[PDB]
Design a protein around this ligand. Structure first.
Ligand SMILES: *[C@@H]1O[C@H](CO)[C@@H](O)[C@H](O)[C@H]1NC(C)=O
Ligand SMILES: *[C@@H]1O[C@H](CO)[C@@H](O)[C@H](O)[C@H]1NC(C)=O
Ligand SMILES: *[C@@H]1O[C@H](CO)[C@@H](O)[C@H](O)[C@H]1NC(C)=O
Ligand SMILES: *[C@@H]1O[C@H](CO)[C@@H](O)[C@H](O)[C@H]1NC(C)=O
Ligand SMILES: *[C@@H]1O[C@H](CO)[C@@H](O)[C@H](O)[C@H]1NC(C)=O
Lengths: 361, 361, 361, 361, 361
């Protein structure tokens, strides 16, 4: 008994199978369960607000036709090249920045058909997907990225889409991201779409990504800290008159402004203020304040010298010098202390907000 | 009663339906109403003078043929793969920098046909569209970007294009741009096209975009301001003779020129002068003037020393020193004041011009 | 009388029309007049020596066959999808860096056919075209960019190509370039091509582009000028002994060399010397000469001090000091004056050469 | 005896050869031996975690059908265009970032068929392949890059894939990489894949790449060393009071931080600390310590001057000056010595770890 | 006598012409002469080790069939669209990084057929070709770039490829490269390919490219020279004690290291040392030596001052001062002289090696 005669028997010009007609026509909507296997997640760009994922898409539906009930085997794996002679549903992705099918050697496809009529359809697809990330807290944040599967041409009365009760979303073993940690939560919900044309089914899968803090420390938090320490050296060491303190102050201020511009390089231009902006602004304020402190002490020394040119005169020299030394020593102790206070509030507030986000999620 | 026989009945080799002939041939022009749904606007580049939009294009026309008048249902949703056996009109976009159709799984298409013959055609298309933006006022401006729909092969005597009276242009809910704010005005007008070949229909949709000012402040207005403040420190603090004031002046001038080059980085090269150029030029003039002020006071001190080497001599020392201190103190008070006057005129004039633009729009 | 029967009548399997045979076979060459409409010129890159233009290409030829002489209408607009059943000529562009046909919705094409047999063929095509620009004078120059239309497979005995006597090249109204001004001259000439395979027709269209000077002034001519002024301050202000004049000199020299590298950034690497290179070299020479002047005066002061350590001694102090002051004052007056002389010769010579180029053009 | 009749005889509509049915249907799995020839390896990017290889893929399987047993010749080379009328297996690459078939002139393909039924299939394919490299030791490391060949649509009961016993992987003669050295080991192992759909065959080939150290020395190890030497000059030469030592210290610290940012430019952002980060951190610590040393000696000189303003006084001047000179001389000798100790431990530990890696490999 | 009947007569279903069978089947190998016309060479990138060339490929072979011997004309130009009904050979390019066929308007192709059966086939093809350039001497070198034409599916017993005896490689008139000079030598040799599958024909064409030295002088040889001159000013001008000589030395060293990194920007990372690296290393050594010289003289002045604090004392002041002045003057004369000696050896050795290379070529 040849397989060929069976293959054209089911689907052919002698069979009444029209591939342009939905199963259960003039009937209850076609229920379709959708399964996702993630082969390779990654390539997340804040500039373009998108990420690229290579997935395996499995969708199962039951057709009343194509129930063979002849061969002694429950299921049979069929050729991928015959997938044009059946009723595949029309499933697109809403937030799509273009996608390409895989044609390495033969088509990366799969067809299976059971005795009752159940069809299993599996497709490999690279999907560039748009994620509108919110960078309110840039180095420490959780981003939720959306995958939506929708019916372009069929309203709710036909082709309803559902998720799979067990193992709807899977991930390949040992799949890692250099910048992000994928969270094994993957909350699944469905949001229907309303248009003037009609009401169309959609189902959504949500992925949670946290940011590694290892890179951001070394790149942008340690060097800014070092520049603040460099500004700190001027107070406890250099004499009141120096052609170097002004140099140290201008070099530290200029490097901080270049570093501040540096931080906003990969980042897209956005109106709101990020956490990294708050840190760089405070460090720039500290360095600027250090230069202004030296400026104030130099000016007090100028009054000492101006009065000096004009015993009774000796009484005021000591008070100006004591004032200059007093403000120098108090600056010396105060600026690392107030920097420490800023660090403990900044770090604990971002820690708590980090805990806070999961409740909304 | 099989649907298949009906489907080939209407459009087939037994029917007299030629898909190469316009409806109402040798007759009144085919009226076509066009509806636009914007799925994802964005990716606006000043360098290439263009933006990329993913839209849904709906065009409705009435064909005297294809009026079925048989089934008890007013409208029927038909297969997308049979869209090659009918008369679609020829609609292209004039300002097009290339476009790609969507082929995720099955074709993203839609066909509906009513009892009278009304056809609804809906297509998903990513369109890179050319916008010739005018950057006379770069950080604060409104840009108008054009979408034009035109008939390539049919003159005005056939295939007239019209807009939809209600809801011609829609936008997906919660659609945002990081740099721009889309305005909910969307004025619709039609501009016919004249060629040596003929006169061809066109309709146009206009979008208004304003620029977020949050990024531009932090990136380019605050740092330039800080450099001007740094130039200001020299006057009220440093002594008349210093190997540091010249350093502070050269570092501030050099950083301002680098920042001025920095501002014109994303921007395309253009002949005219932008608002940001005016601001950077004035700040550079202020920093340069601060260095020149120190230069003038140093020169006056040189005359004091030159005369000093040559009582009657004591009379002129006081006048040179008083002249140096007087010009120093007056510089000290004057430069932030005149900077404040420049800021209030610059900001109010761009505020009023900002109000002014809407009248032309 | 159905249009369909006429349409297959002219071009069909019952007609003797072979689309693989040229009209007037074994006869006089097929004359073809070519008309160009420029929809969007632009995107001119010196790096890749090319520009991208979106055009409308219209070519008209007469076929002795296809003369219908039946319908009461002189001309008829036919379907674009039937353009594969006729004799289109083979026209390629010689200086082509690849091109893409437009497939937004339906094919952007056009067919018309008159009573005598005249065929009008109109095609929309984006063409990346290679322009070998000569940058001898970089900021001020006129570039001539070439479009060539050639026959790949037919020698001169067949398919001769001609231009259109009136309106051969048109440009869309209100079409502008940010960097260039297109000139409304558009000289048309034909240059035949000789190969070992044969002699092939070609026709050429030439476009003249001048460079806007607005960007280049602000970006590269004003800042270099400012650096020269900064070098100038040292002479008229700073004392003979200073730990600042050396700073001002090294900062100005280093910034000029960075700016000189900056100018050659977009530019392709070329052996010959550009005008901008001449300007940056002269300004760098001026800044270097200013540092060398300070160096010479410092050395003369060193001889004054060396002789001072060793009245009769008093006689030579005055001559060394007078020599130092004299060379300082003469440097002070001379360097802006000789800079002015360089500017007037440089600007008038490029002005005259600018006038000169049109004669060759 | 015409070849044509034989060609359609074997594979044709009169033969019972269905190309949609696997050989040995309802039988033992199809054994397939796979041979790889590497034409051009290269283009290894750490940013995208991938490499691009152009290969020749040869797979041999035996079909019980297609055994001609007629012609006197054992093997015959057949047309590449007839490769659509046979049973090619479905082989994809798991870690695939897209691939393109070669269509220069005619298809780059090959078919051979022996008397028994053995089929040889050879295909040229450029493969962008994902390599998840581990940069724990960035300049000196061995990276293992994976090629996996898998069956998309056939479970283990059919289409088993095996390697070739002799010469499974070959490399073109004189094939070199600028950055890497390919190792002639190429360990071959097979890892089966388990899915909810089924169990699918896979075979894997592993390539070992070491990094050339020539570039990294010149680019990043010699310049950082030079900056440390520059910091070293301050101790043995410059006087205790100087407006230059602070300059030399700030310039060296700022250049080291810029160089540290420079090193992490091509590199993807990663949480863990690389070897190059360890080296740059230690050199930055040395330069910072040199500036702090000068700071400490300047402060000791300040106590000497402060006590000096207030014989018995003469006794303490000598002790402060001797303390300043002693710490200066001991800094002078100590810092190159402790730098040498850091270099010998760093280099030997990376040497041993380099030897260590091969055991895991 | 219609041409159409002749056209299907030769190649058709009534003729015995099978396009899947080689001419002279079971016979002597098909000799194929190959002619290359280079339309536009260029776009040579050291980073990707490749160049892009647009060529015309002409291959002539004799088929015993297709000898018409009917029409009074020796040769006839046939339609390009019928090139699928004949035996084109299978010619690919070995070192191929992908290629695209030209489809501007109609196919850029050509067919001619003579009375004897000679076929002329001409194709336009843009080829990105891999050139493994050796950068041992980077600014001055000759690079040899390889084009190989090979048979993918046919072993040596069939389809032998040969070059054309006269005019095998041509170049379009007035074709220039901005960076390179093409040499009119173009040595042609054939290298057969051996595989486990078989032995396959190949022929190779070699192009010689020299580098223009105009850009490299202005960009990287003149500025480094200027920095060395700047280092030279310190010796002959500045006093022994200065807060400026250290500045001039650190600025020159830092700019040289940035310029050294600058030179290796376009260049791919390679282990070996280039000529430009040798020049930048020697100039960096000179600048470093200048700073060390100032350091040594400052230290000798320190011994003079240290001994001064402790007549008999007057005797040693003169010897330390004379030692400092002597080493200063000898440094002054010596460093430009030894720089001149380095320049004459470096330039003559690269001159001779430049002559030397042609012998290997
Ligand atoms: C899909 O599921 C719904 C809910 O159980 C059911 O009402 C509907 O009939 C199903 N569709 C079928 C069986 O075609
Ligand atoms: C389109 O509308 C115009 C204006 O009402 C009308 O004159 C014309 O007949 C319409 N075209 C049709 C009905 O085909
Ligand atoms: C094209 O024009 C030339 C010049 O007038 C003429 O000799 C030739 O016959 C024309 N070709 C035709 C009419 O096919
Ligand atoms: C493949 O090899 C295995 C192991 O020897 C064998 O059991 C199996 O029958 C083979 N498959 C065939 C011959 O189709
Ligand atoms: C090709 O040339 C070789 C060398 O002259 C010759 O032996 C062979 O027969 C030729 N092939 C033909 C004529 O098919």
């Amino acid at each position: 008994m040849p397989p060929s005669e069976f293959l054209d028997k089911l689907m052919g010009k002698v069979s009444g199978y029209d591939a342009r007609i939905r199963p259960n026509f003039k009937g209850p909507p076609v229920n379709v369960t959708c399964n996702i296997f993630i082969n390779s997640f990654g390539s997340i760009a804040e500039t373009t607000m998108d990420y690229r994922v290579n997935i395996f898409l499995r969708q199962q539906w039951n057709d009343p036709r194509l129930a063979y009930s002849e061969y002694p085997d429950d299921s049979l794996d069929l050729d991928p090249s015959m997938l044009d002679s059946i009723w595949k549903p029309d499933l697109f992705f809403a937030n799509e920045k273009g996608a390409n099918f895989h044609e390495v050697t033969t088509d990366n496809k799969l067809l299976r058909i059971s005795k009752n009529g159940n069809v299993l359809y599996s497709i490999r697809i690279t999907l560039v997907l748009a994620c509108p990330m919110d960078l309110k807290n840039f180095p420490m944040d959780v981003q939720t990225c959306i995958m939506q599967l929708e019916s372009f041409g069929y309203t709710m009365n036909d082709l309803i889409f559902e998720w799979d009760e067990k193992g709807a979303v899977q991930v390949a073993d040992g799949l890692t991201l250099p910048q992000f940690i994928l969270k094994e939560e993957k909350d699944l919900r469905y949001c229907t779409k309303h248009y003037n044309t009609g009401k169309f089914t959609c189902i959504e899968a949500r992925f949670h990504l946290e940011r590694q803090m290892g890179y951001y420390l070394i790149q942008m938090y340690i060097p800014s800290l070092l520049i603040v320490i460099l500004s700190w050296v001027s107070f406890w060491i250099n004499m009141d008159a120096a052609p170097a303190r002004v140099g140290l102050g201008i070099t530290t201020v200029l490097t901080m402004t270049t570093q501040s511009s540096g931080s906003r390089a990969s980042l897209p231009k956005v109106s709101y203020v990020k956490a990294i902006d708050i840190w760089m602004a405070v460090c720039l304020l500290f360095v600027f304040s250090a230069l202004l402190e030296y400026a104030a002490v130099n000016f007090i020394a100028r009054q000492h010298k101006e009065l000096l040119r004009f015993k009774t005169v000796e009484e005021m020299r000591k008070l100006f010098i004591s004032r200059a030394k007093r403000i120098d020593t108090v600056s010396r102790v105060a600026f690392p202390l107030v920097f420490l206070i800023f660090n403990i509030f900044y770090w604990i507030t971002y820690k708590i907000i980090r805990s806070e986000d999961i409740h909304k999620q």
